[PDB]
Design a protein around this ligand. Structure first.
Ligand code: CHL
Ligand code: CLA
Ligand code: CLA
Ligand code: CLA
Ligand code: CLA
Ligand code: CLA
Ligand code: CLA
Ligand code: CLA
Ligand SMILES: CC(/C=C/C=C(C)/C=C/[C@@]12O[C@]1(C)C[C@@H](O)CC2(C)C)=C\C=C\C=C(C)\C=C\C=C(C)\C=C\[C@@]12O[C@]1(C)C[C@@H](O)CC2(C)C
Ligand SMILES: CC1=C(/C=C/C(C)=C/C=C/C(C)=C/C=C/C=C(C)/C=C/C=C(C)/C=C/C2=C(C)CCCC2(C)C)C(C)(C)CCC1
Ligand SMILES: CCCCCCCCCCCCO[C@H]1O[C@H](CO)[C@@H](O[C@H]2O[C@H](CO)[C@@H](O)[C@H](O)[C@H]2O)[C@H](O)[C@H]1O
Lengths: 99, 42, 196, 153, 197
């Protein structure tokens, strides 16, 4: 398997899990935690004028609600698992358990 | 003897009697079984 | 129905649930939501272990393995599974892990999204072919049978794992063969009481 | 031979320590008349030393490179006599004491001024209470099960 | 029921109702009634096991010496080779003692709890008092009268000290019990504890 094939397959199978399988769980956990609450109020509600949850980057169209940040997240996991595969395969290491 | 047994019941007199008896016990044991570092009797 | 006659039953263990013999010494199922989670996880552990017991004994009787020999091939780089002698062409370590993850994650995460606590354990329908659910007077008997055989299989899996721990390089049918050859002098006693 | 320690009956440094101490005592024994009382006390100390080293030889003590009996307190049966058989013999005796002095404190807890029995110990009551702690472990066990070991505030 | 030291009075917790109640509690152990009813059971079981032990480590010896049947002397009896291992016996003596001792535990916790078989649910046990089950534990059906219970506890208290005497007559003597008895009857004033030490 060439490394381009490995990277592409693992990334595709990561944001496939993110788009279809592990979407409702991730999003319901997100809604459960919701926001970082500083003394009941959020970080932006209490002030600080910089911790506003960006919506111009999260408004992207999808029937299920996939955004570019989930594309980065599932896909960072993708490239990470791909490079784990690639390095672990390219390293000719013998575990040699019991022998 | 009344009120002498109350004095000998007092904490220092009673402590010196108890620790003199106990120290003599330990001293005579160490005479009988000197230089002990193990309990081999099981 | 009591795991130990004479012990008082917990008030939350009435006997109505399948396999409810009142066994809660440590007091884990005192709150009901944890008890429903525990029932679901008990049935999941049970079903996996009792599917596993054939997958451990059968390939050791005829499949020419001993249920850990089926794993050593992945511990050595270069070499694939001997599914009944023939090697499998689906790769050896990484791609089987990919297929396992991508399949059982989907299955178990479509299992996770169920909200009805009875379908969380006893879904039925597509998982109930042959119509062995249309009569609760026997479905309760069958649920008790599932729980009982599953707890038996869980204990048998402890037997597998610990007979593997005591004897590192054997299998359970070899243990049973040793116990059928010389039953007295080749039992657990040489391990609970190690001679040295 | 645990922890890289030769036994003391086999350790050459242990015998060398014995011989060194014995020569150190004999060099002090020469200054006195062989029948005199200091000389006899030194000879008694010499036999005490010799049988001390012999007993540390025979009781399974392990000697290091320095040549001194080390104690293996881990739990090996061969060396239970170094720590555990004494240790239980401590926890018994110690638990005698605390089970006595506690019980006494419970027996003089219900007095009017119970502080004048702390400084003036009732020898009859204390002598009745002292041997209650002989078999103290079963009393402490049962009082733990009956809840009488821990006050309920 | 009687008194062990006439100068002393029987304590209030020993009302004489129990079997073997000579009022021996100088160290106040059975002062709580729960401890009393637990130590009744501990006495009964240690005494019954001590009776069986003494009868199984002395009667072998009085038959070995006279030559009726040769059998080991209870301390060289472990090292003998049997039809099982040295630990298989421990495995069986765990499997089918855990079951009988935990059922006795459930009995001495609540009396009427454990009297019927798990398998053959019809063959129950009569409602006897705690520590005295009866039924199949009484096949000849000798009655458990209070005099019989007192005889039980007396022979059991005697067998306990007999076992202790055996352990200490092998720990600091080296020989068997009955051999020590014959050594005492040979010259009683010269074959005692104050000659060994
Ligand atoms: C109670 C009890 C007591 C007081 C003893 C006492 C003894 N056992 Mg023993 N055993 C006891 C229960 C049991 N033993 C054994 C099996 C053995 C064996 C196989 C051996 C002993 C030996 C010993 C001696 C260890 C020193 C000592 C005389 C040893 C011995 O007698 O050496 C000569 C020895 O080899 N016991 C079993 C079956 C698992 C028991 C139950
Ligand atoms: C806390 C640390 C500590 C420890 C662990 C020890 C430990 C020991 N020291 Mg050291 N020592 C210490 C602090 C310590 N010492 C300090 C602080 C000093 C300076 C004051 C000394 C000064 C010192 C000297 C100068 C000597 C020791 C000796 C000893 C040994 C004691 C042998 C002995 O007589 O006991 C024997 C046992 C007893 C006395 C206990 C008997 C208790 C009675 C009889 C009741 C037991 C029976 C009971 C009824 C239960 C039976 C069971 C059942 C039938 C009822 C032992 C290895 C001596 C030795 O041999 O050197 C190694 C020795 O000569 N030590
Ligand atoms: C969840 C349960 C479970 C799990 C994890 C496994 C897992 C495994 N089995 Mg087992 N097996 C199971 C249930 C299970 N089996 C059951 C229920 C049966 C009875 C039908 C078997 C009968 C069986 C045989 C006869 C053999 C295996 C073998 C194997 C190994 C290779 C499978 C393979 O590559 O073929 C996957 C191929 C296509 C899907 C693998 C470790 C093989 C092995 O390694 O043994 C030497 C083998 O020969 N299994
Ligand atoms: C002793 C094993 C056992 C038993 C008695 C049951 C019994 C039951 N299961 Mg469970 N189940 C098991 C193992 C078992 N299951 C395993 C291993 C898995 C995986 C599942 C997964 C599962 C799901 C997902 C569901 C059930 C359901 C049911 C119920 C209806 C089906 C029925 O009557 O099966 C009777 C079973 C038999 C007569 C066994 C026949 C022999 C087998 C196939 C031999 C195989 C050996 C080897 C692989 C070859 C009933 C309570 C359904 C339910 O309760 O909802 C209504 C449901 O939704 N089970
Ligand atoms: C019911 C499951 C089961 C079965 C049939 C066996 C059977 C066997 N085991 Mg395994 N074992 C088990 C569970 C089991 N074990 C568990 C749970 C553990 C964890 C501690 C072990 C740990 C273990 C070790 C470490 C060794 C064995 C050994 C043995 C063999 C000799 C028996 C022995 O030494 O006593 C061991 C017996 C037990 C630990 C008792 C557990 C089983 C009881 C009966 C529980 C009740 C289960 C159920 C109600 C009845 C099912 C019976 C049914 C199948 C007819 C024999 C083949 C020895 C061997 O092969 O060599 C050996 O060295 N076993
Ligand atoms: C297993 C040992 C054991 C146990 C649990 C008991 C328990 C009991 N005995 Mg029995 N008894 C025993 C051995 C035992 N006895 C023996 C060997 C003798 C002869 C010396 C007696 C003689 C005796 C008399 C004469 C009477 C009792 C009575 C009692 C009761 C109150 C005292 C108590 O709680 O003691 C608890 C005892 C223990 C926890 C045992 C501690 C043993 C230590 C560890 C050993 C000390 C000696 C050591 C080896 C040196 C209680 C039911 C009285 C009774 O019937 O009241 C109902 C009564 O009148 N006992
Ligand atoms: C209680 C108790 C216990 C634990 C034992 C234990 C033992 N007895 Mg003893 N025995 C007892 C009571 C007890 N006995 C009583 C009450 C009588 C009467 C005997 C008469 C007796 C004889 C005559 C023999 C044993 C032998 C044995 C040994 C083997 C028994 C076996 O299962 O094989 C074993 C050390 C046998 C032995 O040690 O020699 C092989 C033997 O020959 N016992
Ligand atoms: C159960 C009753 C009992 C009986 C009948 C005997 C009988 C005997 N013992 Mg044993 N003994 C017993 C209990 C018993 N002992 C106990 C409980 C211990 C542990 C403290 C010992 C420890 C012991 C040793 C260490 C020795 C004997 C010896 C003897 C013999 C000579 C007597 C002697 O030295 O007095 C010793 C008597 C006692 C220390 C206490 C006797 C108290 C009993 C219970 C009163 C019975 C009336 C004799 C056959 C000696 C021998 O072998 O010859 C010997 O060397 N015995
Ligand atoms: C159970 C028992 C013995 C059981 C023995 C068995 C099974 C022996 C088996 C064997 O030999 C055979 C058959 C054959 C061998 O081949 C193998 C073995 C295995 C060796 C002894 C208990 C033995 C128990 C003993 C000795 C207990 C003594 C207790 C005393 C003296 C208590 C005194 C007090 O507690 C009171 C009564 C009241 C308090 O208030 C005051 C004080 C003073 C504290
Ligand atoms: C639009 C659309 C579509 C498509 C889409 C796509 C195709 C997407 C993709 C996406 C992607 C493709 C993504 C990716 C991402 C990635 C990432 C995010 C990355 C990250 C990375 C990282 C994080 C790294 C790290 C590292 C490094 C740096 C190296 C070293 C090692 C490591 C691994 C550590 C379709 C047609 C279906 C339909 C319509 C819609
Ligand atoms: C918080 C408390 C609970 C958690 C910690 C529990 C740890 C308890 C440790 C118990 C380990 C018992 O096992 C221990 O005994 C064995 C033999 O009996 C020893 O076995 C070893 O003995 C010799 C020591 O010199 C070695 O030369 C041998 O190679 C080896 O056989 C090991 O030292 C250890 O395996």
């Amino acid at each position: 398997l060439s490394p381009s094939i490995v990277i592409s397959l693992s990334t595709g199978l990561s944001l496939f899990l993110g788009r279809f399988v592990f979407f409702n769980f991730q999003r319901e956990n997100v809604a459960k935690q919701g926001l970082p609450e500083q003394n009941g109020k959020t970080h932006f509600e209490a002030g600080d004028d910089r911790a506003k949850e960006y919506v111009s980057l999260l408004k992207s169209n999808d029937p299920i609600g996939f955004n570019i940040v989930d594309v980065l997240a599932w896909g960072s996991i993708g490239h990470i698992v791909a490079y784990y595969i690639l390095a672990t395969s390219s390293n000719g290491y013998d575990p040699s358990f019991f022998g | 003897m009344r009120d002498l047994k109350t004095y000998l019941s007092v904490a220092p007199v009673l402590s010196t009697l108890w620790f003199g008896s106990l120290a003599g016990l330990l001293i005579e044991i160490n005479r009988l079984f000197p230089d002990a570092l193990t309990f081999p009797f099981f | 129905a009591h795991w130990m006659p004479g012990e008082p039953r917990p008030a939350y263990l009435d006997g109505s649930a399948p396999g409810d013999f009142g066994f809660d010494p440590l007091g884990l199922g005192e709150v009901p939501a944890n008890l429903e989670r525990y029932k679901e996880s008990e049935l999941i552990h049970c079903r996996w272990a009792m599917l596993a017991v054939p997958g451990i004994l059968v390939p050791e009787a005829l499949g020419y393995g001993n249920w850990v020999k089926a794993q050593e091939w992945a511990a050595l780089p270069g070499g694939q599974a001997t599914y009944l002698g023939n090697p499998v062409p689906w790769g050896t370590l990484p791609t089987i892990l990919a297929i396992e993850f991508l399949a059982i994650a989907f299955v178990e995460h479509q299992r996770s999204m169920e909200k009805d606590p009875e379908k969380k354990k006893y879904p039925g329908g597509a998982f109930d072919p042959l119509g062995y659910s249309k009569d609760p007077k026997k479905l309760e008997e069958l649920k008790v049978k599932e729980i009982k055989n599953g707890r038996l299989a869980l204990l048998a899996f402890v037997g597998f794992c610990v007979q593997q721990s005591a004897y590192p390089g054997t299998g359970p049918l070899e243990n049973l063969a040793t116990h059928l050859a010389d039953p007295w002098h080749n039992n657990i006693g040489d391990i609970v009481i190690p001679f040295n | 031979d645990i922890s890289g320690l030769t036994p003391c009956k086999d350790s050459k440094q242990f015998a060398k320590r014995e011989k060194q101490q014995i020569k150190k005592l004999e060099s002090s024994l020469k200054l006195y008349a062989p029948e005199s009382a200091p000389a006899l006390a030194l000879n008694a100390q010499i036999e005490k030393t010799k049988r001390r080293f012999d007993n540390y030889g025979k009781y399974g003590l392990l000697c290091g490179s320095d040549g001194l009996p080390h104690l293996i307190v881990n739990g090996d049966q061969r060396h239970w006599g170094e720590f555990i058989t004494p240790g239980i013999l401590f926890l018994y005796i110690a638990g005698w004491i605390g089970w006595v002095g506690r019980s006494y404190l419970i027996a003089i807890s219900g007095e009017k001024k119970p502080a004048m029995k702390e400084i003036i110990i009732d020898v009859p009551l204390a002598s009745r209470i002292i041997f209650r702690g002989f078999i103290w472990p079963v009393a402490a066990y049962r009082e733990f099960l009956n809840g009488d070991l821990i006050a309920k505030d | 029921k009687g008194e062990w030291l006439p100068g002393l009075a029987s304590p209030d917790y020993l009302t004489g109702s129990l079997a073997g109640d000579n009022g021996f509690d100088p160290l106040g152990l059975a002062e709580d009634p729960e401890n009393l009813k637990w130590f009744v059971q501990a006495e009964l079981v240690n005494g019954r096991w001590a009776m069986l032990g003494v009868a199984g480590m002395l009667l072998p010896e009085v038959f070995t010496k006279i030559g009726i049947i040769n059998v080991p002397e209870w301390y060289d009896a472990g090292k003998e080779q049997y039809f099982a291992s040295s630990s298989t016996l421990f495995v069986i003596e765990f499997i089918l003692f855990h079951y009988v001792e935990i059922r006795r535990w459930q009995d001495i916790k609540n009396p009427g709890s454990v009297n019927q078989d798990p398998i053959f649910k019809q063959y129950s046990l009569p409602k006897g008092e705690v520590g005295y089950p009866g039924g199949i534990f009484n096949p000849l059906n000798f009655a458990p009268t209070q005099e019989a219970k007192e005889k039980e506890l007396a022979n059991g208290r005697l067998a306990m000290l007999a076992f202790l005497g055996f352990v200490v007559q092998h720990n600091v003597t080296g020989k068997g019990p009955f051999e020590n008895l014959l050594q005492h009857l040979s010259d009683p004033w010269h074959n005692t504890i104050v000659q060994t030490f």
